Ligand binder design. Structure first.
Ligand code: F6C
Ligand code: F6C
Ligand code: CLA
Ligand code: CLA
Ligand code: CLA
Ligand code: CLA
Ligand code: CLA
Ligand code: CLA
Ligand code: CLA
Ligand SMILES: CC1=C(/C=C/C(C)=C/C=C/C(C)=C\C=C\C=C(C)\C=C\C=C(C)\C=C\C2=C(C)CCCC2(C)C)C(C)(C)CCC1
Ligand code: SF4
Lengths: 139, 29, 80, 65, 31, 42, 65, 46, 137, 739
């Protein structure tokens, strides 16, 4: 389970929907030095408590926006984490992936979907007809 | 460059246009 | 899901990673540029296709390219 | 090429293809695109500088003095 | 003098053959 | 008379039955069949 | 910002005053106002008169009076 | 005053001045010689 | 020879149009000119044919005048733009007109056809294809 | 995932409504189907073509059957000039008695529609006389459609699926389609004209029961084999001949009289028979040009790759490098489709331009509504075909063109001076638009100020000279065919001008549409048409040549033909794909064809009124078009139903509004864009989720239509409204005002 107390919020219509209970849901947890007012990702204002806070959200973009544009940029809070929660209770911590923010280079991170050429050297689609490979995926 | 083929084709087409105009202006019949 | 590719013209300016609203990109060590880092897209399943990374990329032409592909629940940005 | 040289861009996808730029610096390391070229006219993103390799440039004027 | 009842019925019966053949062709193309 | 739809052509009852059948009787079953076809799980 | 608002509002008031002065001057100098006051029900009000250069003087409708 | 002179050389101001001058020229041509038509320019008045 | 077009002074419909006209600055002398010089169709309105060897000056004079004026404007603009290229801040000279430069450009463009012919002969008129930005094929 | 669509796993895994929509939009794009090979692609296309031919045959059979069942063909034969042809009966169970009475006409006792497709005249000219013949034709076409459906099924069976090499053999296909599909079919049609159509037009019944022992000509086939061909041209139909009767009827089967039959005011049947005989001979000759299996014949690849001109070194034909093109066309189905669509569009335009001036069907020139409908129909189809040709040219540029196999040839050169091409097209468009609009509004201002004489009225002297050269003596020119002493009119070496008398009679006739008199208004509208053509071509060519890439998007070819945009970066890239260029060009095609059909319809309406002066004096300013064409002729159309009652125009009255509705709807799809609707749909999703008693729930998540889908839907609504509105106006203004 995920620990933390939910922020003071009187309710709203921008919360979770059937997708949260049927397909997936996200949880953003953080710690603040004091109780203070922030803006909910889907409208309205909530009050984050002094201890550790936990907020349920429908999309990962909500958590990314809240953590970056509000928690770090405004409240100087850097310990926020975003988890993906499945209906069967399985939870994976997805942000930050390896405990280091993605914008900061970290050793051990492999190159994914890297093309060893400039973009202007992609082959023409006439080369790869009926071969099933896109020009950007060509070797 | 003088562009021989281009100028020959262009002059042939222009001569055709000029002949059509000459018929059109009652210069020739 | 969409496809995000990074080409060897990347200068490691980290702007695309900062611009991404769903944490698709990250900076990984590299030796092809002065910054000694290059962008990567390990989490393209979370890519929505907003192309904010392309807007943030300063190279000419773009060092990061987004190709829209099969649409999923999260790539359509659906909260329902 | 070197600093102060005038070059013509040969990169096909570049906004400044067959245009004229000025070399601002050349990187001495083994990076892929060491030459930095500045341009008078901005591209569609408002950027007026870029990185090129030597084979993507054609020198058209030596640096002054 | 337009066609009679029998001609209309015969045309309706004959049109069944192109209908069945069209169904066969559509199902074959779907394969 | 011109107070009702009639037909001087052969088998004038044919439009009388086919217009309802094609336009507001069969179309809903056809839509149901298409809906079943396009919603079938793989 | 507020000082700018105040000054711009004075400017817009000046513009409105210029427009009102124009309306009154055109009603005083290029109108049939007196004739209309003589016969309100049989005279069409008119306060714009065009010059005669390109046949646009046809727009000078016979408005009575 | 030099700033005013520099302002007077702005593209919109110069464009407005040029358009006003050309419009005045054309208007005076219409007033002095109304009804000019192709096949009539530079011909004596009958 | 074209027969459907006759001089306007001999067209009954044009005469009817002349009589029925208002008596203002805009109609009297214009109608006198049209009757004397124009060719009218069956509708009584002047028509402009391009099938007469005669009155060829009536066609060439306006065409030549417009071509001269348009070439003057274009050459003035081109010379001004080429003169502003050597400056450090040409965009500032395109939002701020440089009066001596514009006057010089206009004075030179007064003789624009000869200058254009000279530039074409010397190859100065056009830039070569390989020094012009182009998109990838 | 779902089973539907079967051809795309990416769409089948889509959990939103988009999956359905795109499934319809990509069903016939066989090349993008999963696991698609070239051979399977060609086989599927071949079967689909069989299906389309079967559909066409069924459509023709249905037209024939409905005319034979509910029409008045036999009554119309006895008086084609005064009987309204009947398309089919009306069964709308929600009509009122006034509507039933209004639509009961043309001699029928039940509500009917009046046929405007001209099929009555066509069937009458080709010798059909009874409803039984139409019924037999309909049954035969049903059987033919069944045969083609069976062939389509059969050629998908494993033993009958053709190989890729069979599809790629260009030379035998060209030979067979030139000699057999074009030549032999034309010869068979000429045979039908000689054996059936002409005898029926001469009051003699020829059918399947007696055509074997009824010679079409007294001289028989002996005259053809002996070489006495002139016997077939002896004793043509006299100028007093009455159609469908022996009065004044001749015996010749192949004449070259020219002009029109004096009574029917249409082309001579014998002239058409000789025309099709000559066309058959020419196409059969042409079908022997290419080498298939016996050594003789040209090889297209050799001609394209040739570099020697009788010893001299040349880059190719006209000293232009054409090498490598054979594989380019042969391997690109989109290239071939581009030529096919362009040729079909040009042919449809030619059909429209030549059918009203030279009517081929008896009395069809006196059915004004039919003439207008046919011209508008074929012109709009031609415009659509041209748009398709250029769209598939762009598709070829993206998908099938590879630079290295086309290095140095003419296609590469076009791609290399695309900038000059596009810039010069833009210059032509700007010049035409500026000067045409300026002259129009100058004339408008002058007419508004009571100075209609001050209009600039440029005479179309070149077209008038062409008309005079074709024999029109109205303008006073004395050149070529309008000069009886000219070398062309006399044809001095041979004097074989057997066309000149009838052709001149038709040209100088004042009651037909052969080289209609033209003035300044025709000049201005022709330049407007040129502007429309050049702008549509500019849009299409710019889309095709920039399809692979531009400065804004150097890597466009990697994104495909149809994609929404490349995001708001680099200034914004809305409508940047070549598909978007085709989408934009459809608007200009509609505008250009609107101008063309407006011109044709107004000129012919003025002619049919007896008020040609109205068009002559009002077409030179745009207010004339707005007032005397639209406003003046809309009255009867908009009075089809009113508070005082209804008449036969009511349908058009309603449809006129219907089109105006659809057009309006398109604006909503074209002005408002996706995100607004996506947010609204999210709000509605919340509303549905929180409402009790609403047990329904979506299986596909509701989303707003995609950007490209929205553009397509808006374009479809726009086009449908355009076509419906103009068709209703055309039919109502011509039919309610004439016979
Ligand atoms: C399925 C089921 C279902 C259900 C149940 O279950 C429902 C329900 C609801 C409620 C809750 C509400 C209220 C109601 C009303 O008023 O409105 C409607 C009406 C109607 C009529 C609707 C309809 C209903 C149902 C559908 C019925 C059916 C029946 C039939 C007859 C069937 C037939 C079949 C055959 C085969 C054809 C609503 C609504 C809305 N919707 Mg809603 N739905 C649904 C469906 C659908 C679809 C498909 C779509 C698309 C088109 C939509 C749309 C919409 C919109 C836009 C809106 C709005 O606005 C609204 C609201 O939100 O407010 C607030 N939606 N919804
Ligand atoms: C393109 C097209 C077009 C064309 C072509 O061409 C035209 C032409 C005409 C003619 C013919 C006449 C005269 C000529 C003269 O003036 O002569 C002198 C001069 C000289 C000789 C020379 C002069 C030269 C100059 C000065 C140079 C410069 C120019 C500039 C550059 C321009 C630009 C500027 C700006 C505009 C400001 C006329 C006139 C009229 N209009 Mg009409 N245009 C048009 C357009 C328009 C529009 C849009 C509108 C509307 C606004 C209108 C209006 C009007 C009115 C109201 C009236 C008049 O009362 C006039 C009369 O009477 O009538 C007859 N219309 N024009
Ligand atoms: C494509 C040809 C075609 C078309 C467009 C029409 C059109 C029409 N027919 Mg019709 N009909 C046709 C062929 C056609 N007919 C043939 C060949 C027959 C003889 C079997 C009939 C027999 C017939 C009768 C008996 C009646 C009509 C009627 C009607 C009208 C109402 C529609 C209806 O009830 O359909 C009825 C249709 C049928 C009973 C059979 C249709 C068979 C055709 C060949 C199917 C065509 C399928 C098409 C090609 C595939 C479309 C593909 C899709 C992508 C568009 C309408 C004007 C009615 C009428 O007169 O109302 C006033 C009516 O009562 N039709
Ligand atoms: C909203 C303000 C407004 C507007 C739209 C106009 C508009 C006009 N004025 Mg006007 N005018 C205005 C304010 C305005 N005026 C004011 C404030 C004054 C007082 C100084 C005048 C004094 C004035 C005179 C003395 C004349 C015009 C004239 C004109 C006409 C031609 C103007 C021209 O050639 O330039 C035009 C209809 C002329 C006119 O109508 O000619 C008959 C003219 O002779 N105006
Ligand atoms: C310096 C003036 C100048 C000159 C010499 C040209 C020359 C040319 N233009 Mg061009 N153009 C100009 C200004 C100029 N342009 C401006 C200001 C615009 C923006 C409205 C355009 C927009 C434009 C388009 C959209 C197109 C051209 C095209 C062309 C080419 C053929 C058609 C033509 O003459 O244009 C016709 C003229 C116009 C369309 C508008 C120009 C009229 C402007 C208002 C005059 C400006 C004069 C300038 C202010 C003088 C200041 C000088 C002073 C400081 C001394 C030709 C190379 C066409 C082309 O590519 O052909 C291959 C084409 O499609 N031009
Ligand atoms: C004399 C022999 C002959 C004849 C009559 C045809 C006839 C036809 N072939 Mg064909 N073909 C032939 C030999 C022949 N083929 C050979 C030898 C090959 C192998 C090299 C092919 C390979 C072939 C392919 C691969 C395809 C055809 C197709 C077609 C049809 C085109 C659609 C149509 O109706 O055109 C319209 C007919 C007209 C007469 C219109 C002409 C009027 C124009 C517009 C004016 C000029 C048509 C029926 C297509 C098809 O599938 O149809 C079922 C197709 O895709 N042919
Ligand atoms: C305004 C342009 C126009 C006009 C006047 C015509 C005229 C004609 N077409 Mg036509 N057509 C056009 C454009 C046009 N076409 C285009 C662009 C297409 C391509 C889609 C077609 C496709 C087409 C077919 C497939 C057929 C015709 C036929 C006909 C003829 C009989 C129909 C009729 O009375 O006219 C048409 C009168 C109208 C008012 C046109 C609008 C009709 C509807 C309301 C348009 C909207 C369609 C629908 C409601 C929306 C989707 C569902 C007639 C000569 C028929 C034929 O050949 O006769 C045997 C036939 O079968 N046309
Ligand atoms: C013989 C003629 C012909 C043929 C064989 C093709 C074949 C093809 N075209 Mg093409 N095209 C043609 C004429 C033709 N076209 C013309 C005349 C135009 C100009 C309008 C176009 C414009 C065009 C575009 C712009 C595109 C294609 C595309 C395609 C390919 C995929 C088709 C598709 O999207 O799925 C099937 C598509 C549909 C079924 C479309 C839905 C129906 C539309 C919206 C019309 C609306 C229906 C209307 C209300 C009533 C119509 C009658 C009704 C019975 C349907 C396919 C190879 C696409 C492609 O290759 O993608 C890369 C593509 O983007 N074509
Ligand atoms: C009435 C509607 C209308 C008009 C007039 C135009 C006009 C034009 N379109 Mg266009 N277009 C329209 C609707 C229209 N479009 C729609 C609905 C679509 C579908 C989205 C398109 C799609 C389209 C495309 C895709 C293309 C065009 C192009 C063009 C230009 C080519 C014609 C030309 O140069 O003529 C001459 C120019 C005109 C007639 C424009 C009017 C000029 C005015 C009258 C001058 C007045 C000057 C005056 C001082 C202004 C007063 C001051 C004011 C600023 C306050 C032209 C500017 C093409 C283009 O840019 O080629 C160069 C092109 O590629 N259009
Ligand atoms: C006789 C006549 C006519 C006709 C004509 C024609 C047919 C013509 C043609 C023409 C042509 C066929 C032309 C061509 C051209 C080409 C080119 C290639 C050009 C170029 C140009 C340029 C380059 C320019 C430049 C400039 C200048 C000089 C000035 C200004 C500036 C600029 C820069 C623009 C008409 C009826 C109309 C009218 C009457 C007379
Ligand atoms: S892809 Fe572009 S934005 Fe991202 S690190 Fe490389 S250069 Fe910077």
């Amino acid at each position: 389970t995920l620990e933390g107390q939910t922020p003071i919020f009187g309710g709203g219509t921008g919360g979770l929907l059937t997708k949260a209970e049927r397909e997936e849901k996200y949880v953003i947890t953080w710690t603040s030095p004091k109780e203070q007012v922030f803006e909910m990702p889907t409208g309205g204002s909530a009050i984050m408590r002094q201890g550790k806070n936990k907020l349920e959200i429908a999309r990962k973009e909500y958590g990314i926006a809240l953590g970056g544009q509000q928690l770090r940029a405004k409240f100087k809070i850097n310990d926020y984490k975003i988890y993906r929660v499945y209906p069967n209770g399985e939870t994976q911590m997805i942000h930050p992936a390896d405990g280091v923010f993605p914008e900061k280079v970290n050793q051990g991170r492999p190159k994914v979907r890297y093309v060893d050429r400039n973009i202007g050297s992609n082959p023409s689609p006439a080369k790869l007809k009926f071969s099933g490979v896109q020009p950007y995926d060509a070797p | 460059a003088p562009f021989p083929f281009r100028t020959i084709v262009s002059l042939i087409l222009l001569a055709g246009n000029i002949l059509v105009a000459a018929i059109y202006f009652h210069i020739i019949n | 899901s969409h496809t995000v590719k990074i080409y060897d013209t990347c200068i490691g300016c980290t702007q695309c990673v900062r611009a991404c609203p769903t944490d698709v990109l990250e900076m990984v060590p590299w030796d092809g540029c002065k910054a000694a880092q290059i962008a990567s897209s390990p989490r393209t399943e979370d890519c929505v296709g907003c192309k904010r990374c392309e807007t943030a990329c300063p190279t000419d032409f773009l060092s990061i390219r987004v190709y829209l592909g099969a649409e999923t629940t999260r790539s359509m940005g659906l909260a329902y | 090429v070197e600093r102060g040289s005038k070059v013509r861009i040969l990169r096909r996808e570049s906004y400044w293809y067959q245009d004229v730029g000025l070399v601002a610096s050349v990187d001495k390391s083994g990076i892929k695109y060491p030459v930095i070229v500045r341009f008078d006219k901005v591209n569609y993103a408002g950027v007026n500088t870029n990185n090129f390799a030597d084979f993507e440039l054609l020198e058209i004027e030596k640096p002054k003095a | 003098m337009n066609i009679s009842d029998t001609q209309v019925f015969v045309a309706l019966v004959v049109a069944l053959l192109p209908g069945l053949l069209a169904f066969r062709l559509a199902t074959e193309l779907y394969k | 008379d011109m107070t009702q739809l009639t037909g001087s052509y052969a088998a004038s009852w044919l439009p009388w039955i086919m217009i309802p059948l094609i336009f507001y009787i069969l179309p809903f079953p056809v839509f149901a069949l298409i809906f079943i076809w396009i919603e079938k799980e793989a | 910002i507020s000082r700018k608002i105040f000054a711009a509002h004075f400017g817009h008031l000046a513009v409105i005053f210029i427009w009102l002065s124009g309306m009154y001057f055109h009603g005083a100098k290029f109108s049939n106002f007196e004739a209309w006051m003589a016969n309100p029900t049989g005279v069409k009000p008119s306060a714009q008169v065009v010059w005669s250069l390109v046949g646009q003087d046809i727009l000078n409708a016979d408005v009575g009076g | 005053m030099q700033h005013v002179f520099k302002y007077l050389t702005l593209a919109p101001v110069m464009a407005t001045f040029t358009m006003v001058a050309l419009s005045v020229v054309l208007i005076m041509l219409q007033i002095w010689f109304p009804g000019l038509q192709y096949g009539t320019y530079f011909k004596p008045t009958p | 020879a074209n027969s459907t077009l006759v001089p306007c002074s001999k067209s009954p419909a044009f005469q009817a149009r002349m009589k029925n006209a208002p008596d203002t600055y805009y109609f009297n002398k214009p109608f006198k000119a049209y009757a004397k010089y124009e060719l009218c169709g069956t509708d009584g309105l002047p028509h402009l044919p391009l099938d007469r060897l005669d009155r060829a000056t009536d066609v060439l004079v306006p065409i030549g005048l417009f071509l001269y004026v348009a070439g003057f404007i274009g050459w003035s603009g081109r010379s001004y733009l080429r003169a502003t290229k050597s400056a450090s801040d040409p965009e500032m000279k395109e939002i701020f007109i440089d009066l001596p430069l514009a006057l010089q450009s206009i004075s030179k463009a007064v003789l624009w056809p000869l200058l254009a012919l000279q530039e074409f002969l010397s190859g100065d008129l056009t830039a070569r294809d390989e020094e012009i930005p182009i998109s990838p094929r | 995932a779902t089973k539907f669509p079967k051809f795309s796993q990416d769409l089948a895994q889509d959990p939103t409504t988009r999956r359905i929509w795109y499934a319809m939009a990509t069903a016939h794009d066989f090349e993008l189907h999963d696991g698609m090979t070239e051979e399977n692609l060609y086989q599927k296309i071949f079967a689909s073509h069989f299906g389309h031919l079967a559909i066409i045959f069924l459509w023709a059979s249905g037209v024939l059957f409905h005319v034979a069942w509910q029409g008045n063909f036999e009554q119309w034969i006895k008086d084609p000039l005064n009987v309204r042809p009947i398309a089919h009966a009306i069964w709308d169970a929600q009509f009122g008695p006034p509507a039933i009475e209004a639509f009961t006409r043309a001699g029928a006792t039940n509500p009917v529609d009046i046929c405007y497709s001209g099929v009555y005249h066509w069937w009458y000219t080709i010798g059909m006389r009874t409803n039984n013949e139409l019924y037999v034709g309909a049954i035969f076409l049903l059987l033919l459609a069944a045969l083609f459906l069976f062939a389509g099924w059969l050629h998908l069976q494993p033993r009958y699926r053709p190989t890729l090499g069979w599809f790629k053999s260009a030379e035998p296909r060209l030979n067979h389609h030139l000699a057999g599909l074009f030549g032999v079919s034309s010869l068979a049609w000429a045979a039908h004209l000689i054996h059936v159509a002409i005898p029926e037009s001469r009051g003699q019944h020829v059918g399947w029961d007696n055509f074997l022992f009824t010679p079409p000509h007294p001289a028989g086939l002996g005259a053809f084999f002996t070489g006495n061909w002139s016997a077939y041209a002896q004793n043509p139909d006299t100028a007093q001949h009455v159609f469908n009767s022996s009065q004044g009827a001749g015996t010749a089967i192949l004449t070259f009289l020219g002009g029109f039959h004096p009574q029917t005011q249409s082309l001579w049947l014998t002239d058409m028979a000789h025309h099709h005989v000559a066309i058959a001979v020419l196409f059969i000759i042409a079908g022997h040009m290419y080498r298939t299996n016996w050594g003789i014949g040209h090889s297209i690849k050799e001609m394209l790759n040739s570099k020697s001109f009788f010893g001299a070194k040349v880059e190719g034909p006209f000293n232009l490098p054409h090498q490598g093109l054979y594989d380019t066309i042969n391997n690109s189905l989109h290239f071939q489709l581009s030529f096919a669509l362009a040729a079909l569009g040009v042919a449809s335009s030619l059909t429209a331009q030549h059918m009203y001036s030279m009517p081929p069907y008896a009395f069809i020139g006196q059915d004004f509504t039919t003439q207008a409908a046919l011209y508008t129909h074929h012109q709009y189809i031609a415009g659509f075909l041209m748009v398709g040709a250029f769209s598939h040219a762009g598709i070829f540029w993206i998908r099938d063109y590879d630079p290295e196999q086309n290095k140095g040839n003419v296609l590469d050169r076009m791609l290399r001076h695309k900038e000059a091409i596009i810039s010069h097209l833009s210059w032509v468009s700007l010049f035409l638009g500026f000067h045409t609009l300026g002259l129009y509004v100058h004339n408008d201002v002058e007419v508004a100020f009571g100075a209609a004489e001050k209009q600039v009225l440029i005479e179309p002297v070149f077209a008038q000279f062409i008309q005079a050269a074709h024999g029109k003596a109205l303008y006073g020119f004395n050149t070529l065919l309008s000069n009886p002493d000219s070398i062309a009119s006399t044809a001095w070496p041979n004097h074989a001008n057997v066309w000149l008398p009838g052709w001149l009679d038709a040209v100088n006739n004042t009651t037909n549409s052969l080289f209609l008199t033209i003035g300044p208004g025709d000049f201005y509208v022709h330049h407007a048409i040129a502007l429309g053509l050049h702008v549509t071509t500019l849009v299409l060519v710019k889309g095709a040549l920039d399809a692979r890439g531009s400065k804004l998007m150097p890597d466009k070819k990697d994104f495909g033909y149809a994609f929404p945009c490349d995001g708001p970066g680099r200034g914004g890239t809305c409508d940047i794909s070549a598909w978007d260029a085709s989408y934009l060009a459809v608007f200009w095609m509609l505008n250009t064809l609107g101008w063309v059909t407006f011109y044709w319809h107004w000129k012919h309406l003025a002619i049919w009124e007896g008020n040609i002066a109205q068009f002559n004096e009002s077409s030179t300013y745009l207010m004339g078009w707005f007032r005397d064409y639209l406003w003046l002729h809309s009255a009867q159309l908009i009075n089809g139903y009113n508070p005082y009652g209804t008449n036969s125009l009511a349908i058009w009255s309603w449809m006129f509004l219907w089109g105006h509705l659809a057009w309006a709807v398109s604006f909503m799809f074209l002005i408002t864009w996706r995100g607004y609707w996506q947010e609204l749909i999210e709000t509605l999703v919340w509303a549905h989720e929180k409402t009790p008693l609403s047990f329904g729930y979506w299986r596909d998540k509701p989303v707003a239509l995609s950007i490209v889908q929205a553009r397509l839907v808006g374009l479809t609504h726009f086009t449908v409204g355009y076509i419906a509105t103009y068709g209703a106006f055309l039919i109502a203004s011509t039919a309610g005002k004439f016979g």
